Amino acid sequence: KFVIAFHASVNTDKTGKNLIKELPDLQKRGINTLFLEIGYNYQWKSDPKLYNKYVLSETVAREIAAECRRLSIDLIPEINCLGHQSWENETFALLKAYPELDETPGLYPSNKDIYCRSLCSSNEKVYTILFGLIDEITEVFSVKKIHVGLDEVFLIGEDACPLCRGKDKAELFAGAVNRLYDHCVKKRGFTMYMWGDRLIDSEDEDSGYKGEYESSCNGTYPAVDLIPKDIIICDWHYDELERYGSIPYFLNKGFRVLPTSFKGIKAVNALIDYSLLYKDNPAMLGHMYTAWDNFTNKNLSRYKPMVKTIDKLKAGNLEHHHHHH
Ligand SMILES: [Zn+2]
DSSP states (O other): OOOEEEEEOOSSSHHHHHHHHHHHHHHEEEEEEEEOOOOOOBSSSSGGGGOOOOOHHHHHHHHHHHHHTTTTEEEEEEESSOOOSTTTTTHHHHHHGGGGGBTTTTTTTGGOOOOOOOOOTHHHHHHHHHHHHHHHHHHHHOEEEEEOOOOOOOOOOOOTOOTTTTSSSSHHHHHHHHHHHHHIITOOOOOOEEEEEGGGGOOOOOOOOOSSSSSSSOOOOGGGGGSTTEEEEEOOOOSSSSTHHHHHHHHHTTOOOEEESOTTTTHHHHHHHGGGGGGGOTTBBBEEEEOOOOOOOOTTGOOHHHHHHTHHHGGGGGGOOHHHH
């Protein structure tokens, strides 16, 4: 038996119903788990500063949860709790409402010359806010699971932060993971998921990857030995490679791993094939598909690289049932 998951995003009452459309179909393909990214795109009751009526309401949200439940789909909301506080020249809700919590105050206007802004990982107000959002979203969905993001954190320990300047980037990162863990797991008893790229040494030859996005080039990877190992690592690599050497890196470290793909058809294939080289390790959980080129959630069950490959793994969950007549 295997985890088969799909990553979808939702930010409006519409995009939610689009997803609802595809849940029945996506189930029949074989999806049994839905990672649902929300960010700050829910009408928050718990913080009025981050609320706008033009995003997902409590009603639409309780329907996705309703539908996942009827279809026995493990639902896991995601809020990115450190990096990805902006995209291109739009800064997201938290940092425009709380500019004091920016890790790089006063530096990159309109986000020129950086990938994405990040929150200050040392400022306690961040955790006060984030913990409040994690509690609300896990409530409206009636779930005990949370994905905290933590991918592609390039801005951390920056000189501009009065709070983090000069500090060790890996310890700051491990500090973020461990604060989130203390709330989601220690206090709430949830299961917590995260992206794994910051835990990998890019320069390492067995576990490293080419770029500076799929693996760490800013020295955060030592945090892998400073965080609790019941955290589920979502390990994403979207290029066709003959070896995805970070799967066994995470596995031997004690983590449960969820390999993650995007586009490529073969690239997807190759990840799945290499992940299945460890099929008989239970900490090799399964697989997650992404369709980042799909911005609506319409025909998500038609995502081509998934529909082909999914039976690939569906077989381990077939369950011979025997004639009832
Ligand atoms: Zn800081």
